[PDB]
Amino acid sequence: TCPFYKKIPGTGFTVDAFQYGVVEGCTAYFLTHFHSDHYAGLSKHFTFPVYCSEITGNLLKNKLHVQEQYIHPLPLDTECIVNGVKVVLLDANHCPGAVMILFYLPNGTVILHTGDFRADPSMERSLLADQKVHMLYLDTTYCSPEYTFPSQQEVIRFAINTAFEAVTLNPHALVVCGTYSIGKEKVFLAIADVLGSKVGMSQEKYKTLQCLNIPEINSLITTDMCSSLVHLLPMMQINFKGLQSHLKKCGGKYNQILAFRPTGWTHSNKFTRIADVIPQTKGNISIYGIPYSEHSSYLEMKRFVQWLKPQKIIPTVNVGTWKSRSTMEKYFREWKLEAGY
Numbered sequence: 001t002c003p004f005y006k007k008i009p010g011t012g013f014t015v016d017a018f019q020y021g022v023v024e025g026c027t028a029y030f031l032t033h034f035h036s037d038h039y040a041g042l043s044k045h046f047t048f049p050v051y052c053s054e055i056t057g058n059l060l061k062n063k064l065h066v067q068e069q070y071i072h073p074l075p076l077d078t079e080c081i082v083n084g085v086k087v088v089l090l091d092a093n094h095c096p097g098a099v100m101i102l103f104y105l106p107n108g109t110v111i112l113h114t115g116d117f118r119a120d121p122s123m124e125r126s127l128l129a130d131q132k133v134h135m136l137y138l139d140t141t142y143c144s145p146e147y148t149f150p151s152q153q154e155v156i157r158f159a160i161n162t163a164f165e166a167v168t169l170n171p172h173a174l175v176v177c178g179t180y181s182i183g184k185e186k187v188f189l190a191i192a193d194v195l196g197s198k199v200g201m202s203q204e205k206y207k208t209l210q211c212l213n214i215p216e217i218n219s220l221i222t223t224d225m226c227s228s229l230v231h232l233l234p235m236m237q238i239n240f241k242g243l244q245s246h247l248k249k250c251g252g253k254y255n256q257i258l259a260f261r262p263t264g265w266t267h268s269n270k271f272t273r274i275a276d277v278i279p280q281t282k283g284n285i286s287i288y289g290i291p292y293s294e295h296s297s298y299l300e301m302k303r304f305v306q307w308l309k310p311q312k313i314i315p316t317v318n319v320g321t322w323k324s325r326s327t328m329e330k331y332f333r334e335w336k337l338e339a340g341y
């Protein structure tokens, strides 16, 4: 049954709750972003309102085939009335189309649901700054002090450099980039731009990217693999048995694959910096794992929460075990005591 942490008190509203059938008393199902654990349940046979960003609506319509009439996109940063309740959608700094939602209840309570987010200082000067928020439904994916990671701009810098040097040394080298969902487009789009290439991909992956309101996208992606030296493949295929094979498929056109795997955190974050990363090499192929995150670091989350000073915090990730729940509450208390809310 729909968990309590996906229900907004004093509304007929639920958040990211599509896999429990008809939720009793739900007049509106919000969707924060197009990642499968969050949309699990939607199909062409959904006949209840869905409220989401414009980009998310393009993905619902074109990838899952939901019918134009049941998709209600809202603009960002704009006060909207939904079934007699004022809401606002804010950019979550997660994947394309991902939002946070602000709900202003008739009784005067104000609730922020983060969806999935990477907290940033720029959020402290958004519409959030204009009033008190009482309840915070929080993306706690990396809510532990070991989770440090660098800035996206640092990680993208590294990648642009590795690739440029490798291709300038060997003009017949391929850059491959691993993907499974939307997210992390900047990794591959940045490398393509330094190399003067479009990024080549399958027809389904091209389909996904054409929903995203990226400007000038027609100049940046293609379905013609042969014309292109940055390629996207499945992350299930980013390995030696899979790369070798893929290098065979190109028809004696490249003699070296340099590939990137953009992961959130892995335990080699604790001991090695970004400047001093190495790859795994079997022959002419080399695979690099890069810590590109679209979720808050521990410190990023902590700063945001200490600035917001909510009266109550409900975690939405890592809630399945008592040990995890207990561990997060301890951090929340630490934070509150240090700050004096």
Ligand code: NI
Residues within 6 Å of the ligand: 033, 035, 094, 116
């Ligand atoms: Ni997500």
